[PDB]
């Protein structure tokens, strides 16, 4: 019935779909305030009451839908700037086991905004693309150290992103399950 | 970087019999069959470095 | 002094920054190589030129000096992307610059990057070179170390910690080494000027470029062209290499299985063999059995039971060539053989030695002989052992050895030697003018059912998957028939060595169907086809 | 050239000009001229190839002009070998008398290129040449009552090829 | 930018050798023309073995000095018109291209990208797929396809040049009083001229040659090629033109001519092309059609 | 300079002659004529075309090549076979 590759996990398309439901801040280039939108899964007042160059908050999928056309501009999140990413890299280097406290959707949102909204950043984009890479590489080192503690009981993780978890899910759970089977078989 | 003059039609000829010590450092013109040939190698031109072919 | 640091800084910033679209291709490649414990990087010239032409200019002017700087830059990046120890990484290059024919290389090209191509003709064994090396000072017993790199060195004489004129020795107990190999490249056959034998070069490679090619292969090479010491003021040239260029699926066996359940498969394979040859039905049937073979067996008391088939043919030239093409492994020869070894083997001379003919060389496959009557005197007696035992044994001039001869023989000619074969037949002809006209029209066309490769792969699959056994009904049938023929001959010879041949034919017939058991259906066709006479 | 080729009987005149010092033996002159001009090579990557070279063999009674016409061909032809097939590449090869030598010729007639290996080394060479050979028929005199095989010391595929 | 055939790809030597203008200026169809090119590179101070190197890998010093070398040397060969200005585009690290090179890539993809009525149909349908094979190359995300287009462009120009030399050396151009006639009865592969665009490229080659070979007699030209499957000749009518460096424009008159003979004629012919200057006619009917055409005053 | 080619008209006759020669060879019990001989006939015809600088082979080239190869083939045989061959082959060795 359901496809074989969706029995236990989410595909990256579903991960993008999940991230798209979050709110984001925009500057509209038109006034809607005095037809009306009449949505059923969100607030409707914000879109009906827009005024040009007045900041407002909407779901990300509608924000990208507007930015497709002239009608809108997207404000970048404050963590997505050179100063903050510098500090997070320094945190990563300083604490050789803890993960730095980046938001749960950082990879997905960065790789959406760099494609759909390359024109709306303040920093030069060719530097952000480097610092995002540095963060992902350091985190991958820390992941490879952690896979030596798979065990029969449990594990704790902190600040690991959704896409990063979903990348690893079928390996961690499978090896952990087999260690559990081997151990309990000796008890019985 | 450099050009070589080739002389042609030198008006006197020897076989490999008639050569004597008086011919030393003189120009000569000779005829025969080529019996054996080596491979080509580079050779140091000046004694920064430069080379030339040799056989 | 500072130039060595600026150059290293430049290549370090190259690896960390080269994007084409959205992927940092050299950072990703360098990380993915370390995970499989491959310490090298394959850079492409065109990307280096695109990034900054000045770097390529420096590299193009002085390659012997600048290649080591780029290699150490790679190591410095490799640590950042994987550590919060590693050897020095090997740089490898790809290029599309114009090829130089091997015959045109000369004194203008010494210490330049050169791209060329040819055929490899020889390969040395591996040998050891030093990279990190430790030193002991004989007088004071002080110690130090040195770092070699392999570009165009000797032990030093500045003694330390008087300390003497030449006091240094090597501690092999605390030093590091790498692999090195030599190769020979010969110019392309379709380039050579007429009436001359081809020219060749010698060349060197180390670490991951070693053990990558074999003799007889055509290759393309990127490397530094240089000279070494070995007339007056004269030296030998060579090349330092920096890069080189040169079972079934499920969907396959499904076709073979569909063929296996076809009700007329035997007819189909017979029809597919030498289709131009008219008539000769039973000849084609026998060649199918020769290609498929029986089943090998081994018993508790160690006796060993043969699997091969042997056939003799008394037009006939075409079939042996066809068998040579369709068979998975094949050898073709005329009765005098390729050397004084003849068909089987012989001793030659100065010390004596031994060499095998075209029975030993075809071991494991099929061999076909084009005129069996032109067999030499020694081979006439030696083929008895080669066929009955599947071996050849010699004890002459102090040599004492035994050789393997595990093969199926096809033979043709135009006596007691016929007893060695399982089946014998005489080729037959027909003289239809349309056939000759068709052949002639095809000859003019070139001058102006199952295909071979599919059939060869199918034969391979069947030989690998199945080895069938006689059912009890077949045993009663065969034994009754055997005693019947001997009784008929007695009241008017058949012998066990022919019963054991009929069994092999029966198994080979069951093998086409992939049936694990042989049945009376196969026994009937086996005795029907046994009418050699 | 085109003027003389436009004239009738140019083929016969070329044959007549062949080997002037030797009387008679017009068929031999015809065959030698045909070998010196030769055909065109062709190939079909679908399973076949055809050489352009033409090979000729002459069975000679003692003193019937064979060695003289070979000397004549040697002076006439552009490149040639007289008796080494590497030196005969895209040329004519001449044999005036006759096991390893015959074995080499067996390989040479089967192939158009030669391959060899020694001490693990492997290499290839080109033959690509027309072969003109002559022989003495198994002693002092030919016997016309018998087929050719009785009068020669050659394998059957030689007479085929 | 230089009126040199694809300068930034292949080599400097090939850029001059296959240039449509250089062939008319130095007569490259024969050795007395080719030696002029060797002579030029020798005087310019460029070693001839480096002039044949791939232009990306050619030495940096020559690359930057080339702009001055041409100012000192093209005058002596009457070849100063090579110099001009044009537009160049580059994106990131992947290297420059000019508009002049881009359109040749596009055109090449048009030409070579991958009873009688059905065959005609099949051919016409194949030519439409190349539209999309061209369309998809207008996108910066698909540079891979553009490189393929360039590789095809080089082969097309090579094959064109190897036919032009045969036409001139065998003197197949027939010099009638009113116009110049040329007909290809055979060739190394005559199929390439079955597409209109390719035929036009060959015509453009011959027109430069005819424009520079003599000062006199600017004439119309007619070019035709046979097809063995249809037994029809594909025919094109071509104007003269004035040299590059030299004033109303001229007008192509073949349209009316072709129209009128078509309206009159017994002959089996086709007119369906957007460019009316291009027609098709069966094998036996070419000579009566051309006879009626030359008899007409419309030329 | 010269690289001749065959003409496709008379090749039907060549195929018929090849078949006829094979039939006659078998009928007298001779060793048979083969594809090698046919290839040699075409190659010799090309050489004859080349001799006059002709880029086309012609019927007389094929006739001369046929005569040369047939006569050579006849010379290899035993005497009784030779007489039967020349009596039948008269329309090739002398006529055409
Ligand atoms: N027209 C001719 N016909 C026959 N012989 C001739 C003719 N003109 C000269 N001769 C001589 O006859 C011989 C020609 O045959 P040739 O084969 O060269 O001699 P040969 O080599 O000694 N015999 P052989 O050793 O069996 O090849 C030479 O001695 C020639 O000088
Ligand atoms: Mg002689
Ligand atoms: Zn000391």
Swiss-Prot record, chain A:
Coiled coil: none
Superkingdom classification of source: Eukaryota
Record family assignment: Belongs to the GINS2/PSF2 family.
Keywords, in A-Z order: DNA replication, Nucleus
Functional description taken from the UniProt entry: Functions as part of the GINS complex which plays an essential role in the initiation of DNA replication by binding to DNA replication origins and facilitating the assembly of the DNA replication machinery.
Subunit composition and interactions: Component of the GINS complex which is a heterotetramer of SLD5, PSF1, PSF2 and PSF3. Interacts with PSF1 and SLD5.
UniProt name for this protein: DNA replication complex GINS protein PSF2
Compartments where found: Nucleus
Alphabetical list of InterPro entries matching this protein: GINS_A, GINS_bundle-like_dom_sf, GINS_Psf2, PSF2_N
Gene Ontology cellular component terms for the protein in this record: CMG complex; DNA replication preinitiation complex; GINS complex; nuclear replication fork; nucleus
GO biological process, one term: DNA-templated DNA replication
CDD domains for this protein: GINS_A_psf2, GINS_B_Psf2
From Swiss-Prot, chain B:
Note: Present with 1690 molecules/cell in log phase SD medium.
Domain of life: Eukaryota
Similarity field: Belongs to the MCM family.
High-level lineage: Eukaryota, Fungi, Dikarya, Ascomycota, Saccharomycotina
Cell compartments where the protein resides: Nucleus
Subunit details: Component of the MCM2-7 complex. The complex forms a toroidal hexameric ring with the proposed subunit order MCM2-MCM6-MCM4-MCM7-MCM3-MCM5; loaded onto DNA, forms a head-head double hexamer.
Parts of the chain that traverse the membrane: none
Function: Acts as a component of the MCM2-7 complex (MCM complex) which is the putative replicative helicase essential for 'once per cell cycle' DNA replication initiation and elongation in eukaryotic cells. The active ATPase sites in the MCM2-7 ring are formed through the interaction surfaces of two neighboring subunits such that a critical structure of a conserved arginine finger motif is provided in trans relative to the ATP-binding site of the Walker A box of the adjacent subunit.
Name of the coding gene: MCM2
Protein name as annotated: DNA replication licensing factor MCM2
UniProtKB/Swiss-Prot annotation, chain C:
Protein species of origin: Saccharomyces cerevisiae (strain ATCC 204508 / S288c) (Baker's yeast)
Name of this protein: Minichromosome maintenance protein 5
The keyword Nucleotide-binding is assigned to this record: yes
Catalysis performed (reactions): ATP + H2O = ADP + phosphate + H(+)
Entry-linked SMART domains: MCM
Cysteine disulfide partners in this protein: none
Record's subcellular location: Nucleus
InterPro entries in the record: MCM (IPR031327), MCM5 (IPR008048), MCM5_C (IPR054125), MCM_CS (IPR018525), MCM_dom (IPR001208), MCM_lid (IPR041562), MCM_N (IPR027925), MCM_OB (IPR033762)
Annotated motif Arginine finger, positions: 419-422
UniProt gene name: MCM5
Keywords for the protein's UniProt record, in alphabetical order: ATP-binding, Cell cycle, DNA replication, DNA-binding, Helicase, Hydrolase, Nucleotide-binding, Nucleus
Additional note from the record: Present with 10300 molecules/cell in log phase SD medium. Early fractionation of eukaryotic MCM proteins yielded a variety of dimeric, trimeric and tetrameric complexes with unclear biological significance. The MCM2-7 hexamer is the proposed physiological active complex.
From Swiss-Prot, chain E:
Top-level division of the source organism's lineage: Eukaryota
Localization in the cell: Nucleus
Subunit structure: Assembles into a complex with MCM5/CDC46. Interacts with MCM10.
Additional remark text: Present with 1730 molecules/cell in log phase SD medium.
Family (UniProt): Belongs to the CDC45 family.
Reported function: Required for initiation of chromosomal DNA replication. Acts at the origin of replication. Also has a role in minichromosome maintenance.
Annotated protein name in UniProt: Cell division control protein 45
Span within the parent record: 323 to 650 of 650
């Amino acid at each position: 019935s359901l496809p074989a590759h969706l029995q236990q996990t989410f595909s990256p398309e579903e991960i993008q779909f999940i991230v798209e439901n979050e709110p984001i801040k925009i500057f509209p280039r038109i006034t809607t305030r005095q037809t009306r939108w009449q949505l059923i899964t969100t607030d409707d007042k914000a879109l009906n009451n827009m005024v040009a160059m007045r900041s407002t908050e909407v779901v990300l999928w509608i924000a990208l839908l507007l930015k497709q056309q002239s009608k809108c501009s997207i404000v970048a999140p404050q963590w997505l700037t050179t100063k903050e990413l510098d500090r997070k890299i320094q945190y990563e280097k300083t604490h050789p086991d803890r993960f730095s406290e980046l938001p749960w959707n950082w990879l997905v949102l960065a790789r959406i905004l760099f494609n759909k909204a390359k024109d709306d950043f303040h920093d030069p984009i060719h530097e952000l693309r480097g610092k995002i890479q540095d963060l992902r590489e350091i985190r991958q080192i820390k992941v490879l150290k952690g896979l030596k503690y798979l065990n029969e009981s449990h594990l704790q993780l902190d600040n690991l992103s959704l896409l990063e978890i979903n990348e690893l899910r079928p390996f961690i759970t499978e090896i952990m399950d087999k260690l559990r089977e081997i151990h309990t078989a000796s008890l019985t | 970087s450099e050009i070589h003059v080739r002389i042609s039609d030198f008006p006197t000829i020897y076989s490999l019999r008639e050569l004597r010590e008086s011919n030393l450092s003189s120009l000569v013109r000779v005829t025969g069959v080529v019996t054996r040939r080596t491979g080509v190698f580079p050779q140091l031109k000046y004694v920064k470095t430069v080379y030339r072919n040799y056989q | 002094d500072d130039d060595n640091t600026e150059i290293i800084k430049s290549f370090k910033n190259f690896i960390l920054e080269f994007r084409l679209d959205s992927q940092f291709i050299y950072r990703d490649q360098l990380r993915n190589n370390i995970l499989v414990k491959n310490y090298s990087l394959t850079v492409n010239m065109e990307h280096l030129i695109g990034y900054n032409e000045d770097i390529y200019k420096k590299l193009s002017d002085e390659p012997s000096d600048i290649i080591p700087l780029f290699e150490t830059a790679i190591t410095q990046v490799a640590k950042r992307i994987s550590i919060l120890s590693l050897p020095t990484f090997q740089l490898i290059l790809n290029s599309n610059a114009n090829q130089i024919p091997l015959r045109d290389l000369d004194s203008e090209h010494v210490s330049k990057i050169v791209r060329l191509s040819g055929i490899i003709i020889s390969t040395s064994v591996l040998s050891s070179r030093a990279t990190y090396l430790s030193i002991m000072c004989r007088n004071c017993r002080h110690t130090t170390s040195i770092t070699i790199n392999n570009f165009n060195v000797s032990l030093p004489r500045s003694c330390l910690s008087n300390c003497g004129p030449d006091p240094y020795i090597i501690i092999h107990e605390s030093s590091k080494f790498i692999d090195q190999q030599f190769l020979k490249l010969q110019e392309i056959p379709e380039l050579v000027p007429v009436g001359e034998m081809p020219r060749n070069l010698t060349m060197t490679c180390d670490r991951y470029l070693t053990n990558k090619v074999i003799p007889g292969t055509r290759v393309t090479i990127v490397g530094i062209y240089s000279i070494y010491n070995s007339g007056v003021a004269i030296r030998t040239p060579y090349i330092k290499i920096l890069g080189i260029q040169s079972m079934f699926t499920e969907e396959e066996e499904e076709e073979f299985l569909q063929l296996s359940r076809n009700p007329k498969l035997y007819e189909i394979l017979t029809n597919s063999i030498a289709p131009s040859i008219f008539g000769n039905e039973d000849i084609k049937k026998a060649i199918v059995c020769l290609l498929m073979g029986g089943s090998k067996k081994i018993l508790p008391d160690g006796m060993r039971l043969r699997g091969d088939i042997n056939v003799l043919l008394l037009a006939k030239s075409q079939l042996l060539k066809f068998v040579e093409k369709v068979s998975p492994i094949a050898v073709y020869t005329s009765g005098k053989g390729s050397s004084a070894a003849g068909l089987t083997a012989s001793v030659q001379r100065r010390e004596f030695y031994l060499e095998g003919g075209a029975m030993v060389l075809a071991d494991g496959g099929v061999v076909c002989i084009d005129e069996f009557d032109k067999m030499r005197d020694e081979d006439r007696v030696a083929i008895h052992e080669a066929m009955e035992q599947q071996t050849i044994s010699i004890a002459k001039a102090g040599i004492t050895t035994v050789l393997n001869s595990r093969t199926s023989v096809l033979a043709a000619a135009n006596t007691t030697i016929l007893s060695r074969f399982d089946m014998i037949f005489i080729v037959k002809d027909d003289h239809n003018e349309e056939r000759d006209i068709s052949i002639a029209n095809h000859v003019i066309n070139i001058h102006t059912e199952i295909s071979i490769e599919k059939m060869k792969r199918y034969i391979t699959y069947c030989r690998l998957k199945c080895a069938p056994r006689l059912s009890p009904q077949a045993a009663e049938k065969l034994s009754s028939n055997f005693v019947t023929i001997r009784k008929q001959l007695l009241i008017n010879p058949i012998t066990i060595r022919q019963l054991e041949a009929i069994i092999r034919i029966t198994e080979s017939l069951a093998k086409l169907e992939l049936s694990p058991i042989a049945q009376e259906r196969h026994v009937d066709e086996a005795i029907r086809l046994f009418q050699a006479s | 050239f085109r003027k003389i080729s436009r004239d009738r009987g140019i083929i016969d005149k070329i044959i007549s000009s062949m080997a002037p010092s030797i009387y008679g033996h017009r068929d031999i002159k015809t065959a030698v001229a045909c070998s010196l001009f030769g055909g065109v090579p062709k190939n079909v990557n679908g399973k076949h190839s055809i050489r352009g070279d033409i090979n000729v063999l002459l069975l000679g009674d003692p003193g019937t002009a064979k060695s003289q016409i070979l000397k004549y061909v040697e002076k006439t032809a552009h490149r040639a070998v007289f008796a080494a097939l590497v030196l005969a590449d895209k040329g004519v090869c001449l044999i005036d008398e006759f096991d390893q030598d015959r074995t080499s010729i067996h390989e040479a007639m089967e192939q158009q290129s030669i391959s060899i290996s020694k001490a693990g080394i492997v290499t290839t060479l080109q033959a690509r040449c027309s072969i003109i050979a002559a022989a003495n028929p198994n002693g002092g005199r030919y016997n016309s009552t018998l087929p050719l095989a009785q009068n020669v010391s050659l394998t059957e595929p030689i007479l085929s090829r | 930018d230089y009126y040199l055939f694809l300068l930034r790809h292949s080599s400097l030597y090939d850029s001059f050798y296959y240039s449509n203008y250089v062939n008319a200026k130095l007569s490259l169809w024969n050795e007395n023309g080719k030696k002029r090119l060797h002579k030029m590179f020798a005087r310019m101070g460029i070693p001839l073995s480096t002039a044949q190197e791939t232009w990306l890998y050619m030495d940096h010093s020559i690359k930057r000095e080339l702009g001055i070398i041409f100012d000192k040397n093209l005058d002596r060969y009457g070849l100063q018109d090579i110099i001009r200005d044009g537009f160049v585009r580059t994106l990131g690290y992947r290297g420059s291209i000019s508009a002049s090179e881009f359109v040749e890539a596009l055109t090449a993809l048009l030409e070579v990208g991958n009873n009688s009525a059905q065959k005609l149909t099949n051919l016409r349908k194949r030519w439409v797929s190349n539209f999309w094979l061209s369309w998809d190359a207008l996108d910066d995300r698909k540079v891979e396809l553009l490189n393929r287009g360039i590789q095809l462009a080089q082969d097309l120009q090579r094959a064109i040049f190897n036919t032009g030399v045969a036409i001139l050396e065998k003197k197949l151009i027939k010099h009638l009083r009113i116009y110049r006639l040329c007909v290809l009865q055979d060739g190394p592969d005559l199929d390439l001229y079955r597409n209109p665009l390719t035929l036009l490229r060959l015509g453009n080659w011959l027109i430069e040659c005819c424009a520079e070979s003599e000062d006199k007699q600017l004439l119309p030209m007619v070019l035709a090629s046979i097809d063995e499957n249809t037994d029809t000749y594909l025919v094109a009518g071509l104007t003269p033109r004035y040299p590059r460096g030299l004033k109303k424009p001229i007008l192509n008159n073949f349209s009316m001519a072709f129209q009128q003979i078509t309206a009159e004629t017994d002959a089996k012919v086709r007119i369906d092309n957007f460019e009316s200057s291009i027609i098709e006619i069966r094998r036996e009917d070419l000579s009566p059609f051309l006879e009626k055409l030359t008899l007409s005053g419309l030329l | 300079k010269i690289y001749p080619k065959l003409h496709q008209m008379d090749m039907d006759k060549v195929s018929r002659v090849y078949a006829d020669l094979r039939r006659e060879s078998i009928s007298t019990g001779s060793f048979p004529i083969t594809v090698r001989h046919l290839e040699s006939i075409l190659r010799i015809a090309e050489s004859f075309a080349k001799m006059r600088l002709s880029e086309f082979v012609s019927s007389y080239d094929l006739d001369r090549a046929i005569k040369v190869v047939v006569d050579s083939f006849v010379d290899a045989q035993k005497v009784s076979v030779r007489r039967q061959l020349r009596r039948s082959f008269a329309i090739y060795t002398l006529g055409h």
